[PDB]
RNA sequence: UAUUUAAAUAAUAUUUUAAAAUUUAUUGAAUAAAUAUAGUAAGAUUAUUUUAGUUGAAUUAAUAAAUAAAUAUUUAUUUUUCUUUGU
């Protein structure tokens, strides 16, 4: 999560949604807590969808 | 480097500089200025090619010149292990046979299909080789040349959904033994799949109507 | 670059991450039929110093919008599952790119990974690009800036990059798409 | 076995060590004529020891201690003035160095006087060195810039640009050094001989001279506010660099390991035709002189221009079937007369 | 001998006569002396313009991409290409217009060429592939027969164990893709060197040989063995193109000189091999493609051996019609999806 | 004396005539053999320092992945927890507590 | 006939800025014009620097 | 070169103007003016012919003749051999030994 | 015996008669 | 040294001695002391203190040796003993690659500056 | 004169 | 290019049968040599007697060889006449020999 | 069994797959047009081969000029085997392209009635910058360098060393160059 | 005899197409070219007329 | 069962002289065939001036154990350190 958060902070505005999706997928693969993976999916949706 | 203009260095040459043959036009020169290509000797093959084999590949000795030491030579007798078979241990008799036919025995009726990637199909449709309006069939695939004739063998194909998570448009395709994920993806998209398991003569009639 | 197995052994991570320490994260693999763009490597390319400006990943990725349209039409950019898009072109119009990269008949990029002496089934691989047109040496210098430690040869027909696998072919394709070819 | 080089190890003979002659201006053109066109709009001297002193002086000038470099240059310049005759290469060069030392010490008027003396000596010089004249006029430009004459400084800089674009060959410095990568016979180890490279900032000092010249010109243009001049200078500099790189270009030969064939270096290293001289003396523009008085072939009209002979009798064409039977001879009967009717004169 | 060999320079005297000739020998005057044949570039064939005349609007120069025109002349009728022009991966990316000639050595009009056919910049690898295939196919494989020990009946007389055999010799198989690519590259090389001439018709007033010779003399066609040869591609004309040759010209072109007429095509049939596994024992002939390329096709060897290349407008039309579908299929999808849009 | 045609190296120094072995600093055959053996043993001990980590069904060797997958694909159709298929082939028991375990 | 009566003088193709003309082609094109073409000066005559005839 | 006088008098070079072997023609084009400007005393006898002898001959001021073979040899090597010719006097041949250090 | 190596031609009888 | 065993040869190789008659200069660290104690019968050693070295070489006394070592370039011939000749070859190849990259980066930075100047000039001419 | 002439050799499987 | 055509079988090289080679290499026949004029290892190459090997010669000079041995009366109709190829024709000039006169090589009638 | 016309085959008919109201998507049918051109060329070639006539120009083989180059039995077999099948393939291609043209016209009408004239004209356009490149490179010289000879591109045309050439008459109208050569390095 | 693509033999546009010709040479004079064309036309006419005579 | 990345569809051949008598026939021990085949005894095998690694190791017939070693061809890992080191 530290590495992925550094990538999220240092990402490019057009690259933030993809890196957020990658973080969510890596969390689900690592079997992170359900609240963590839901928060990461929500953050990915927030950065991807303009109306969201 | 000369110290003065009055006393220049001599022009006496070394062996490296003196023993130099004439320059032959190479591929770079012939591509830069094609006015030099005036004969057939200028059409040199790929520079990766060295030439004919000029030495003997002697085992345990490398590459030797012709006429060299043939004393310690075994590649000749090889072209004309015991330490591993010293204990009478045959590998083909050590392990037993799982079945009389063997593993993966392609008997008549095994239904060994040829893989066809749903990602490949979607790529072809987005490219324009295949028209999504008409119903997709093996004949349409072969004519659009999305799959070469070498991959065709009875039974025709299997629709494998590799690397695909969503089909945006409905696709109406006819194949054999499509995977469950591919079927459900097409159904979700709205297209209608119809597993058409054909006999040999039926497949030949479909490919050459 | 975190050793999940070592962290679990030392007690720095929960013991449920053994699947993460054993198997990599599942991602749609980039293929010649499925252009699965990787935002991480594209961001790395954007951060790397190059002379030519690359398009944004938002424009490189095909649009993903509502699919309530009754009938589809022939837009140059439409919803595609495999992520196929026509070449966008240069990023800044007031520039001249010294080289031009043609696509193949199926719209695939020129990157093809071969093997040295494949009869012996040798794991050593190399990449060959034989669709570059224009100034091949500028493309070769850009490949030098991309892969610093690799051996890159150039000829009239093909540019060879030795000791690079599909993991490098995908980076080459990403850079080509960002440039606009 | 790896070498430690802890003992004395003599160098290896390499084609990059070939002595290259300094570029000379043509005899008809003179630097004073070019400047006017631009204005339109021996006794025994211990030269070894004085060269030691001059080397120490330029080391001082590079280190930064300028007054000591100035006095070293003065000593060795007195030596050269006594030794060499009027308007000599090392003479004008060392007085260029002396003017540079004077300018680095602050005596700008004496620097300008010395550089104008360099100009009037290049006037009388018969074939001055291209590098020497370029460095001299760069020195005069930098002295004018230090005095405050930035217009004249950039004028001298574009003068250097014009001279080196007009009377300089760009592909000579990489004539023998471009085909060196083809000497690579090993790929796994020692494969840097396939990637050998020689920076152009070392083998033709005039190129680095004009590079720094145009760099200072760009700085002066940015300081003044002449964006057109800055763009022009940058374009010309980039064009020069591209010319040099293109003359250095070459395609890659064999890539993998090539055992044997050690006698291929004779073909690898030779009088390699550089791309510059190729595109200059292409056989269609530099048409060779081919006089027919020494040959036995000529166009249809110029039949009598072949090498003369005694009692030349045209028998027939060498149809190899004439040695066959009477049927074959009847087959080739009319051929001689038809060929005569073809090659008849106008 | 070899360059790095002791036997290379042991002939240290006598090779030359001290006394020079009195008719051809001369002294070197200086740098202003023009020596016959002296040239800085290594030219194994030092042929110049006068000896080997080139027929083109301009002499091939490094400034010009191709020696022919770049824009239609307003004082000459311009004829566009029969099929629309597309620029592929190897095309010159520049308009090419050739000044078509008449049988009276006069320029009639100007016809645009095809960059896919005459714009595919040449490449030494493909040229060498074509040349090697031609020189290995044209050799006589029936004369490679040799004796064997079982064939010799009673060492010197005893034949070798593995002798050369007509069936054991190899005839290679070349694909139509590389064949067409090499032929196009050779045509482009001829165009760049400036020895390509486009004529409306190749027709003789009488099918005899003296009329052919008179035509060649009137249009300055060097046909002699020693002079530069000619390679004809007869196809009829622009209005009436024909796959076969004109009968009169085909009868008259049989001259002892260096002139060869070839079929107006650059493709070839797909070569098949029905004896790949040596099933038929009684087959005589080399292994490999049993359907080789005939002699009357265009080829790199004959194109290099013959100086001038005279193609007819019928041949141009046939080549364009045969290469249309190929240059359309080569295009990438985002380009070929626009062909019906542009028409 | 396994190779019976010794290599002739270029003689840059006269002591290369007196020397017999090519690489003197290099250990002899059996010594370097036992050295490499000890190094491989040390590397294996460093690798097995931590406990034997267990891997999922996907991160298994090919001769076991498909078998372990087909042994449980029948139960994978019905999504219910607490379903184990005790298969014969697989990762053996280490015999001690493991942090990965 | 129309084009010959319209254009008596050679157009911009009769230029030497890039390469030398071919005397054979000039002799062939001689008939299409009124002024002699094969008469070539030793200097690379350009359209802009000098007027042609 | 003895007491300010060159020993080599003539340099015979035979070549062909149209046949082939562009090495001698490259030499005559590129390095011949340089050599002639450096040593204007020696006389270069050029011989055009159909089948040229790929060899250079040096005739010295005492009747001696020294020939070098330049078949498919680069013009740089040709120039080097010509300079070796003009450098040697070709009047004797003695080995290099302690007894032959002093003539 | 390898009979497939030969073609179908009758060899001359040895010794040949006059 | 080649007459002795492989261990003494390894120690002399560490001391940077390959043949008979070679002389090297080493520090007085315990590692070098141990190596010389191991090979004390094949080499003869002389001792020079720091002041004795400052006298033997023409260096003033107000200049230490750390500054001299920091000033001398690291690109000296055979700078580092890499563990393999393949590593040595690829290090030299990377050095040549860095030279070529220096040149091409200079050219590309020039091109970038010219392009930015052109863009600024065009924008100013528009406005 | 004439003896047992060798023919083409059939390839293996 | 599927298995590009072999360069050694290009019909240009024909060496003596060596222990190395390819199955498609056309070596010289048994009992015959490669070079025609190499009767011995020291046999000098003939001066002007050329043997047109391979394809049919475009111009067969009467002194050259083509599927024939050197017959004096057949290859030399007149010994005092020298045949050359000028403008793709057989020109029969008078034979001259070089003699040293006044320090130059003059041409005299060879038969005389 | 009509899998060639694009509709469902008899197997799908028996299965009862509802695929008739499927969709109406625009399609250029460029690949189908290319294949139709190929098939038409092949049909014409087959007819020309079938209609071959002996035309012997030599007197030895002159007793065949009136006959066909085929034996009538083999001519009938050829007509029934290849010439008659090429026409069927051509008809299949034509039918598919006509169906797609009908669907394209319907899609054009739908777009015109939904969005508008210019909106549909822009939505049904495939023009791209690389399309402009492939079709006319003069409108693309500035955008990128796509020439096989990059050294002659007008962007990099400054590298070509234009020499000072002159036509000498004393040599016979020969073009030579005026500038002097460069002194090449000889030894070390 | 054996299998041979008789359906391919006679299909080419010209007579020289689809014939196993391995007795030619890289250079052919005027008589050589005339004899090559003669032999091709004669081979075609021989095949055709022999087949016709046999079947009749 | 199918939720994981590639590819230049090409086959034909593979030392030589010999180490043995059985075979298939004919004429009254000879005659003519057999590159028939010998786990295969022995020898001969055509081409200087060259450019990088080891000089006596390895040796476990047979259920879930990290790994045989030499010789030779290609080919890959520029991380720290006082110097060195062919993995
Ligand atoms: Mg090894």
Which subunits have 3 or more CB–CB pairs within 8 Å of chain I?
A: E, K
Measured on CA atoms in the order D114, D119, D120, D125, is the torsion positive or negative?
A: positive
| Residues paired with residue H60 on neighbouring β-strands, in sequence order | H8
- Tell me, rounded to whole angstroms, the distance of Cα F18 from its chain centroid: 42
Interatomic separation, CA of residue E325 and C1' of nucleotide O8, rounded (Å): 25
Residues of chain E positioned with their CB less than 8 A from the CB of B45: 125, 128-129, 132
Determine which of B28, B33, B39, B40 to mutate to test the interface with E (most E C-beta atoms within 10 Å): B40
Burial (0-12, 13-18, 19+ Cβ within 10 Å), C100: buried
- Tell me which residues of chain E have a C-beta less than 8 Å from any C-beta of chain G: 49, 53-61, 63-64, 67, 69, 71, 73-77, 99, 101, 105-107, 194, 220
Closest residue in J to D232 (Cα) is J114
Instruction: Report which of D127, D129, D121, D66 is spatially closest to residue D97, judged by C-alpha positions.
Output: D66
Inter-chain contact B11–M35, Cβ cutoff 8 Å?
no
Interatomic separation, CA of residue I15 and C1' of nucleotide O34, rounded (Å): 17
Distance CA B67, CA L19 (A): 10
Distance CA A5, CA A19 (A): 9
Backbone angles phi, psi at M146, to 5 degrees: -120, 30
CA of F40: nearest nucleotide by C1' is: O67
Put residue F72 in one of left, alpha, beta given phi > 0 → left and psi -120 to 50 → alpha.
alpha
Q: How was this structure determined?
A: cryo-EM
Contact D309, L93 (CB under 8 A): yes
Distance CA L1, CA B112 (A): 33
Residue with tokens 């001289």: D277
Contact F75, F85 (CB under 8 A): yes
DSSP-assigned states of every residue in C58-91: HHHSPP------SS----SS---SS--------S
Question: What contacts H41, CB < 8 A, 6 or more positions away?
Answer: H6
Distance CA H53, CA H69 (A): 9
Contact E112, E96 (CB under 8 A): yes
Question: What contacts L85, CB < 8 A, 6 or more positions away?
Answer: D296, D318, E226, L59, L61, L91
Contact E92, E115 (CB under 8 A): yes
Contact H13, H47 (CB under 8 A): yes
Question: What contacts M104, CB < 8 A, 6 or more positions away?
Answer: M26, M27, M29
Distance CA J36, CA J12 (A): 8
Which tokens belong to F101?
Answer: 């375990």
Grouping H, G, I as helix, E, B as strand and the rest as coil, residue B58 is strand
Instruction: Report which of D273, D66, D44 is spatially closest to residue D176, judged by C-alpha positions.
Output: D273
Share of chain K residues as helix, strand and coil, in percent rounded to the nearest 5: 0, 10, 90
Contact K8, I15 (CB under 8 A): no
Grouping H, G, I as helix, E, B as strand and the rest as coil, residue D118 is helix
User: Which H, E and C letters describe D24-86, residue by residue?
Assistant: ECCCCCCHHHHHHHHHCCCCCCCHHHHHHHHHHHHHHHHHCCHHHHHHHHHHHHHHHHHHCCC
Instruction: Report which of D238, E273, D101, B13 is spatially closest to residue M158, judged by C-alpha positions.
Output: D238
Closest residue in H to E48 (Cα) is H18
The contacts found for F64-73 with CB under 8 angstroms, 24 or more apart, are F64/F89, F64/F90
Measured on CA atoms in the order C26, C31, C33, C36, is the torsion positive or negative?
A: positive
CA of B52: nearest nucleotide by C1' is: O47
Distance CA E107, CA G31 (A): 9
CA of E191 to the centre of ligand 1 (A): 54
Which subunits have 3 or more CB–CB pairs within 8 Å of chain F?
A: B, C, J
Grouping H, G, I as helix, E, B as strand and the rest as coil, residue F36 is helix
Inter-chain contact D306–L59, Cβ cutoff 8 Å?
no
Give the strand pairing for H43-48 and H8-15: parallel
CA of C125 to the centre of ligand 1 (A): 20
DSSP-assigned states of every residue in E124-166: HHHHHHHHHHHHHHSS-STT-----TTT-----SSPPSS---T
Distance CA C135, CA C116 (A): 27
Backbone angles phi, psi at D56, to 5 degrees: -60, -35
- Does D235 contact J at CB distance below 8 Å? yes
Closest residue in M to G39 (Cα) is M173
Question: What is each CA distance from M177 to E61, G49, L70, M169, in whole angstroms?
Answer: 13, 21, 50, 14
CA distance C155 to chain D (A): 5
CA of J83: nearest nucleotide by C1' is: O85
| Residues paired with residue J79 on neighbouring β-strands, in sequence order | none
Contact M124, M43 (CB under 8 A): no
Interatomic separation, CA of residue E195 and C1' of nucleotide O4, rounded (Å): 57
Q: Using CB atoms, which residue from C8, C19, C22 is nearest to F99? A: C8
Q: Residue D185, Cβ neighbours under 10 Å: how many? A: 20
Instruction: Report which of J26, J3, J28, J4 is spatially closest to residue J15, judged by C-alpha positions.
Output: J26
- Does L11 contact N at CB distance below 8 Å? yes
Angle between helices A34-48 and A16-30 (to 10 degrees): 160
- Does E46 contact H at CB distance below 8 Å? yes
| Residues paired with residue B173 on neighbouring β-strands, in sequence order | B136
Distance CA E305, CA J25 (A): 71
Whether omega for the bond prior to residue B155 falls within 30 degrees of 0, making it cis, is yes
Question: What is each CA distance from M110 to C69, C71, E287, M115, in whole angstroms?
Answer: 12, 9, 62, 8
Give the strand pairing for L90-94 and H43-48: unpaired
Inter-chain contact L87–D322, Cβ cutoff 8 Å?
no
For nucleotide O14, give the residue with the nearest CA to its C1': B79
CA of F92: nearest nucleotide by C1' is: O64
Measured on CA atoms in the order D311, D317, D318, D319, is the torsion positive or negative?
A: negative
- Does N52 contact E at CB distance below 8 Å? no
Instruction: Report which of D121, D123, D124, D103 is spatially closest to residue D112, judged by C-alpha positions.
Output: D103
What's the count of helices (H) and strands (E) in chain H, helices before strands? 3, 4
Resolution in A: 3.9
CA of D187: nearest nucleotide by C1' is: O75
Q: Residue D189, Cβ neighbours under 10 Å: how many? A: 14
Backbone angles phi, psi at L51, to 5 degrees: -105, 115
Contact B85, C43 (CB under 8 A): no
Inter-chain contact J2–F28, Cβ cutoff 8 Å?
no
Contact E197, E68 (CB under 8 A): no
| Residues paired with residue M165 on neighbouring β-strands, in sequence order | M177
After what residues is chain G interrupted, C–N > 2.5 A?
none
Grouping H, G, I as helix, E, B as strand and the rest as coil, residue L91 is strand
Residue with tokens 């050829």: M78
Query: What would you report as the CA-atom Rg of chain M, rounded to the nearest whole angstrom?
Result: 31
HSE (side-chain half, CA atoms, 13 Å) at D281: 19
Q: How many CB pairs under 8 A join B and E?
A: 70
Grouping H, G, I as helix, E, B as strand and the rest as coil, residue M7 is coil
**Length of chain L counted residue by residue:** 112
CA of E150: nearest nucleotide by C1' is: O35
Distance CA C95, CA M155 (A): 11
Residues of chain C positioned with their CB less than 8 A from the CB of F101: 15
Which tokens belong to D89?
Answer: 């290469």
Distance CA H29, CA D235 (A): 35
- Tell me which residues of chain H have a C-beta less than 8 Å from any C-beta of chain M: 29-31, 33-34, 76, 79-80, 83
| Residues paired with residue L109 on neighbouring β-strands, in sequence order | L96
Q: How many CB pairs under 8 A join M and N?
A: 36
Q: Residue A4, Cβ neighbours under 10 Å: how many? A: 18
Question: What is each CA distance from M45 to D53, E268, M41, M54, N6, in whole angstroms?
Answer: 90, 15, 6, 17, 18
User: Which H, E and C letters describe A1-52, residue by residue?
Assistant: CHHHHHHHHHCCCCCHHHHHHHHHHHHHHHCCCHHHHHHHHHHHHHHHCCCC
Instruction: Report which of D99, D109, D209, D203 is spatially closest to residue D159, judged by C-alpha positions.
Output: D209
Contact D275, B32 (CB under 8 A): yes
Distance CA E40, CA H75 (A): 10
Residue with tokens 């036919």: B101
Interatomic separation, CA of residue C115 and C1' of nucleotide O5, rounded (Å): 16
Determine which of C81, C84, C85 to mutate to test the interface with B (most B C-beta atoms within 10 Å): C81
Determine which of A30, A44, A45 to mutate to test the interface with C (most C C-beta atoms within 10 Å): A30
CA of F32 to the centre of ligand 1 (A): 14
- Does C139 contact D at CB distance below 8 Å? no
Question: What contacts D233, CB < 8 A, 6 or more positions away?
Answer: D157, D158, D161, D214, D217, D218, D221
| Residues paired with residue K6 on neighbouring β-strands, in sequence order | I6
CA distance F16 to chain B (A): 23
Closest residue in C to E334 (Cα) is C86
HSE (side-chain half, CA atoms, 13 Å) at H101: 2
Distance CA E43, CA D282 (A): 10
Chain M contacts in chain D segment 175-204 (CB below 8 A): 175-176
CA distance E235 to chain L (A): 28
Chain L contacts in chain D segment 312-331 (CB below 8 A): 312-320, 322-323
Which tokens belong to B72?
Answer: 């310690």
CA of D188 to the centre of ligand 1 (A): 13
Let me know if chains K and E touch, i.e. at least 3 Cβ pairs under 8 angstroms: yes
Grouping H, G, I as helix, E, B as strand and the rest as coil, residue H11 is strand
Put residue B145 in one of left, alpha, beta given phi > 0 → left and psi -120 to 50 → alpha.
left
Share of chain F residues as helix, strand and coil, in percent rounded to the nearest 5: 35, 0, 65
Which tokens belong to A48?
Answer: 């991807």
Contact C73, M124 (CB under 8 A): yes
CA of E278: nearest nucleotide by C1' is: O12
HSE (side-chain half, CA atoms, 13 Å) at M78: 22
Q: In chain L, what's the furthest Cα-to-Cα distance?
A: 67
Interatomic separation, CA of residue E154 and C1' of nucleotide O35, rounded (Å): 15
Angle between helices E176-193 and E313-329 (to 10 degrees): 130
CA of C81 to the centre of ligand 1 (A): 49
Give the strand pairing for C112-115 and C125-129: antiparallel
Instruction: Report which of D272, E128, D181 is spatially closest to residue B22, judged by C-alpha positions.
Output: D272
Angle between helices D205-224 and D130-147 (to 10 degrees): 20
Backbone angles phi, psi at E99, to 5 degrees: -80, 90
Backbone angles phi, psi at H12, to 5 degrees: -85, 125
Backbone angles phi, psi at C152, to 5 degrees: -120, 115
Contact B73, B88 (CB under 8 A): no
Instruction: Report which of F55, E305, M45, E32 is spatially closest to residue D27, judged by C-alpha positions.
Output: E32
Nucleotides on strand O lying under 7 Å from protein C-beta: 1-17, 31-37, 44-58, 60-62, 64, 66-78, 80, 82-87
Closest residue in M to B31 (Cα) is M149
């Amino acid at each position: 999560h530290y590495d992925h958060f550094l990538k999220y902070l240092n990402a490019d505005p057009s690259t933030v949604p993809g890196i957020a999706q990658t973080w969510a997928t890596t969390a689900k693969h690592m079997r992170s807590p359900n609240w963590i993976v839901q928060l990461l999916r929500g953050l990915h949706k927030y950065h991807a969808d303009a109306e969201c | 480097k000369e110290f003065d203009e009055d006393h220049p260095l001599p022009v006496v040459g070394s062996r490296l500089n003196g023993r130099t043959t004439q320059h032959k036009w190479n591929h770079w020169d012939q591509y830069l200025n094609p006015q030099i290509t005036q004969s057939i000797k200028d059409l040199t093959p790929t520079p990766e090619y060295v030439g004919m084999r000029c030495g003997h590949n002697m085992i345990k000795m490398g590459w030797m010149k012709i006429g060299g030491s043939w004393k310690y030579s075994r590649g000749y007798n090889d072209r004309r292990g015991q330490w591993q078979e010293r204990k009478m241990t045959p590998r083909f008799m050590l392990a037993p046979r799982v079945s009389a036919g063997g593993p993966r025995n392609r008997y008549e009726g095994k239904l060994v299909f040829s893989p066809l990637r749903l990602s490949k199909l979607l790529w072809a449709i987005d490219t324009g080789r295949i028209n999504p309006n008409e119903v997709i069939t093996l004949y349409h695939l072969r004519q659009a040349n999305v799959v070469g004739e070498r991959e065709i063998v009875w039974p025709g194909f299997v629709l494998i959904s590799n690397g695909v998570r969503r089909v945006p448009y409905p696709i109406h395709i006819e194949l054999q033994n499509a995977s469950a994920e591919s079927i459900r993806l097409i159904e979700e998209a709205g297209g209608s799949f119809t597993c058409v398991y054909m006999t040999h003569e039926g497949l030949y009639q479909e490919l050459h109507p | 670059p975190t050793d999940v197995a070592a962290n679990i052994s030392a007690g720095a991570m929960p013991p449920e991450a053994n699947v993460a320490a054993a198997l990599p994260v599942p991602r749609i693999q980039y293929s010649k039929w499925n252009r699965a763009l990787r935002s991480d490597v594209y961001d790395e390319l954007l951060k790397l110093p190059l002379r030519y400006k690359l398009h944004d990943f938002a424009k490189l990725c095909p649009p993903q919008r509502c699919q309530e349209e009754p009938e589809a039409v022939g837009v140059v950019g439409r919803d595609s599952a495999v992520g196929y898009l026509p070449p966008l072109g240069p990023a800044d119009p007031l520039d001249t790119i010294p080289f031009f990269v043609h696509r193949s008949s199926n719209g695939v990029l020129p990157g093809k990974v071969f093997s040295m002496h494949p009869r012996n089934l040798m794991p050593a691989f190399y990449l060959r690009i034989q669709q570059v047109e224009g100034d091949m040496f500028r493309f070769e210098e850009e490949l030098l800036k991309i892969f610093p430690t690799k051996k890159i040869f150039v000829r009239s027909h093909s540019i060879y990059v030795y000791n690079v696998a599909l993991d490098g072919r995908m980076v080459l394709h990403h850079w080509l798409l960002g440039l606009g070819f | 076995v790896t070498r430690l080089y802890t003992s004395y190890y003599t160098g290896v003979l390499y084609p990059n060590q070939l002595v290259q002659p300094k570029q000379r201006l043509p005899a008809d053109v003179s630097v004073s004529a070019i400047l006017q066109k631009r204005s339109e709009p021996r006794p025994y001297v211990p030269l070894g020891e004085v060269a030691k002193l001059e080397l120490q002086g330029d080391y001082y000038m590079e280190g930064g201690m300028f007054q000591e470099a100035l006095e070293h240059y003065g000593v060795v310049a007195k030596a050269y003035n006594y030794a060499y005759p009027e308007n000599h290469a090392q003479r004008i060069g060392i007085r260029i160095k002396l003017s540079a030392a004077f300018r680095q010490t602050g005596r700008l008027e004496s620097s300008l006087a010395n550089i104008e003396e360099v100009l009037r000596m290049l006037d009388a010089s018969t074939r001055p060195s291209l590098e020497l004249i370029c460095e001299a006029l760069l020195e005069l430009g930098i002295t004018r810039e230090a005095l405050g004459m930035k217009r004249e400084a950039t004028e001298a800089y574009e003068e250097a640009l014009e001279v080196v674009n007009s009377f300089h060959n760009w592909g000579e410095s990489h004539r023998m050094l471009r085909l060196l990568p083809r000497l690579g016979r090993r790929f796994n180890y020692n494969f840097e001989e396939k990637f050998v490279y020689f920076s152009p900032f070392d083998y033709d000092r005039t190129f680095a001279l004009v590079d720094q010249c145009l760099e200072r010109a760009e700085t002066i243009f940015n300081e003044i506010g002449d964006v057109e001049g800055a763009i022009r200078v940058l374009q010309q500099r980039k064009e020069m660099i591209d010319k040099k790189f293109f003359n250095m270009r070459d395609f890659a030969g064999r890539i993998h390991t090539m055992r044997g064939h050690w006698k291929r270096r004779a073909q690898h290293l030779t009088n390699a035709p550089t791309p510059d001289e190729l595109l200059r003396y292409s056989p269609t523009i530099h048409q060779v002189h081919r006089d027919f008085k020494y040959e036995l072939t000529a166009p249809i009209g110029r039949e009598k221009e072949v090498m003369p002979g005694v009692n030349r009798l045209v028998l027939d064409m060498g149809n190899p079937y004439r040695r066959r039977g009477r049927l074959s001879n009847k087959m080739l009967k009319d051929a001689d007369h038809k060929f005569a009717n073809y090659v008849r004169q106008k | 001998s070899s360059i790095f060999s002791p036997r290379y320079d042991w002939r240290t005297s006598g090779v030359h006569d001290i006394a020079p000739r009195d008719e051809g020998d001369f002294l070197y005057q200086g740098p202003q002396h023009v020596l016959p044949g002296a040239h800085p570039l290594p030219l194994h064939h030092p042929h110049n313009t006068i000896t080997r005349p080139v027929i083109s609007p301009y002499i091939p120069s490094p400034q010009r991409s191709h020696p022919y025109f770049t824009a239609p002349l307003p004082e000459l009728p311009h004829f566009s290409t029969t099929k629309p022009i597309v620029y592929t991966y190897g095309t010159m990316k520049e308009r090419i217009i050739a000044p078509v000639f008449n049988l009276k050595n006069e320029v009639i009009y100007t016809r645009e060429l095809d960059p896919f056919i005459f714009g595919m910049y040449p490449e030494v690898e493909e040229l060498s592939k074509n040349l090697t295939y031609w020189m290995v196919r044209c050799q006589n494989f029936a004369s490679k027969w040799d004796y064997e020990t079982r064939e010799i009946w009673r060492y010197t007389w005893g034949g070798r164990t593995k002798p050369s055999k007509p069936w054991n010799m190899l005839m290679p198989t070349m694909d139509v893709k590389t064949w067409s690519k090499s032929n196009r590259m050779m045509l482009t090389l001829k165009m760049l060197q400036g020895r390509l001439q486009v004529v409306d018709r190749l027709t003789l007033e009488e099918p005899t040989q003296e009329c052919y010779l008179e035509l060649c003399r009137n249009m300055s066609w060097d046909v002699r063995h020693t002079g530069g040869g000619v390679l004809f591609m007869d196809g009829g004309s622009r209005i009436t193109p024909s796959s076969e040759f004109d009968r009169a010209f085909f009868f008259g072109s049989f001259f002892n000189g260096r002139n060869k007429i070839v079929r107006p095509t650059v493709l070839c049939d797909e070569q098949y091999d029905y004896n790949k596994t040596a099933a038929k024992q009684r087959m005589k002939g080399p292994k490999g493609a049993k359907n080789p390329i005939p002699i009357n096709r265009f080829n790199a060897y004959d194109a290099m051996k013959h100086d001038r290349l005279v193609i007819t407008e019928g041949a141009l039309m046939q080549l364009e019609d045969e290469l249309y579908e190929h240059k359309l299929q080569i295009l990438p999808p985002h380009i070929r999806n626009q062909l019906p849009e542009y028409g | 004396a396994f190779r019976r045609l010794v290599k002739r190296h270029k003689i840059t120094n006269n002591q290369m005539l007196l020397m017999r072995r090519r690489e003197p600093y290099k250990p002899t055959m059996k010594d370097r053999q036992e050295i490499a053996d000890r190094a491989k043993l040390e590397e294996f001990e460093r690798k097995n320092a931590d406990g034997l980590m267990f891997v999922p069904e996907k991160a298994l060797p090919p001769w076991q992945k498909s078998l372990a997958h087909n042994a449980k694909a029948l139960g994978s159709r019905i999504n219910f927890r607490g379903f184990r298929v005790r298969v014969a082939d697989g990762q053996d028991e280490p015999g001690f507590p493991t942090p990965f375990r | 006939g129309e084009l010959q009566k319209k254009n008596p003088t050679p157009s911009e193709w009769y230029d030497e800025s890039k390469g030398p003309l071919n005397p054979n082609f000039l002799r062939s094109m001689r008939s299409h014009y009124e002024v002699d073409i094969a008469n070539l000066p030793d200097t690379p005559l350009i359209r802009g620097q000098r007027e042609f005839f | 070169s003895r007491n300010g006088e060159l020993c080599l008098k003539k340099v015979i070079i035979s070549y062909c103007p149209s046949n082939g072997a562009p090495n001698t023609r490259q030499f005559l084009a590129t390095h011949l003016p340089h050599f002639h400007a450096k040593y204007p005393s020696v006389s270069i006898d050029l011989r055009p012919r159909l089948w040229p002898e790929m060899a250079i001959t040096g005739v010295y001021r005492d009747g001696s003749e020294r020939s070098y073979n330049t078949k498919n040899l680069s013009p740089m090597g040709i120039f080097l051999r010509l300079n070796n010719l003009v450098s040697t006097a070709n009047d004797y041949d003695q080995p290099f030994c302690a007894s032959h250090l002093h003539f | 015996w390898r009979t497939w190596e030969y073609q179908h031609t009758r060899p001359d009888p040895r010794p040949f008669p006059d | 040294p080649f007459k002795h065993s492989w261990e003494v040869n390894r120690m002399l190789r560490e001391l940077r001695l390959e043949f008979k008659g070679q002389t090297t200069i080493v520090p007085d660290i315990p590692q070098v002391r141990k190596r010389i104690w191991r090979v004390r019968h094949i080499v003869k050693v002389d001792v020079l203190d720091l002041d004795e070295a400052k006298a033997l070489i023409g260096v003033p006394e107000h200049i230490s040796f750390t500054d001299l070592a920091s000033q001398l370039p690291p690109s000296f011939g055979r700078v580092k003993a890499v563990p393999s000749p393949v590593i040595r070859s690829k290090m030299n190849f990377m050095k040549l690659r860095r030279m070529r990259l220096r040149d091409v980066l200079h050219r590309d930075a020039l091109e970038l500056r010219l392009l930015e100047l052109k863009r600024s000039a065009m924008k100013n001419x528009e406005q | 004169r004439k003896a047992r002439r060798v023919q083409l050799q059939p390839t293996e499987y | 290019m599927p298995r590009p055509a072999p360069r050694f079988a290009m019909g240009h090289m024909l060496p003596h049968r060596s222990n190395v080679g390819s199955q498609f290499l056309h070596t010289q026949r048994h009992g015959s040599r490669s070079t025609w004029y190499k009767k011995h290892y020291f046999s000098l190459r003939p001066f002007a007697i050329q043997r047109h090997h391979g394809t049919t010669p475009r111009i067969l000079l009467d002194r050259s060889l083509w599927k024939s041995l050197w017959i004096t009366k057949l290859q030399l109709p007149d010994i005092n006449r020298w045949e050359r190829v000028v403008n793709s024709r057989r020109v029969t000039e008078d034979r001259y020999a070089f003699v040293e006169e006044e320090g130059v090589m003059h041409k005299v009638n060879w038969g005389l | 069994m009509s899998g060639a016309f694009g509709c469902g085959s008899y197997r799908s008919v028996v299965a009862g797959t509802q695929n008739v109201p499927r969709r109406m998507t625009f399609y250029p049918s460029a690949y189908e047009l290319i294949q139709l051109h190929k098939a038409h060329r092949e049909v014409i070639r087959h007819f020309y081969v079938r209609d071959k006539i002996f035309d012997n120009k030599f007197p030895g083989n002159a007793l065949a000029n009136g006959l066909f180059k085929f034996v009538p039995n083999r001519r009938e077999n050829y007509h029934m085997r290849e010439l008659m099948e090429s026409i069927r393939r051509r008809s299949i291609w034509m039918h598919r392209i006509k169906q797609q043209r009908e669907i394209n016209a319907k899609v054009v009408e739908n777009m015109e009635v939904k969005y508008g004239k210019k909106a549909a004209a822009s939505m049904l356009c495939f023009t791209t910058p690389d399309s402009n490149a492939y079709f006319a490179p003069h409108r693309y010289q500035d955008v990128a360098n796509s020439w096989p000879n990059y050294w002659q591109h007008p962007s990099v045309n400054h590298v070509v060393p234009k020499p000072r050439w002159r036509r000498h008459r004393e040599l016979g109208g020969i073009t030579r160059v005026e500038d002097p050569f460069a002194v090449q390095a000889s030894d070390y | 005899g054996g299998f041979t693509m008789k359906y391919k033999k006679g299909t080419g546009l010209w007579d020289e197409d689809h014939v196993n010709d391995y007795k030619t040479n890289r250079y052919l004079s005027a008589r050589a070219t005339m004899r090559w064309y003669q032999e091709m036309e004669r081979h075609q006419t021989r095949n055709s007329l022999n087949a016709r005579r046999a079947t009749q």
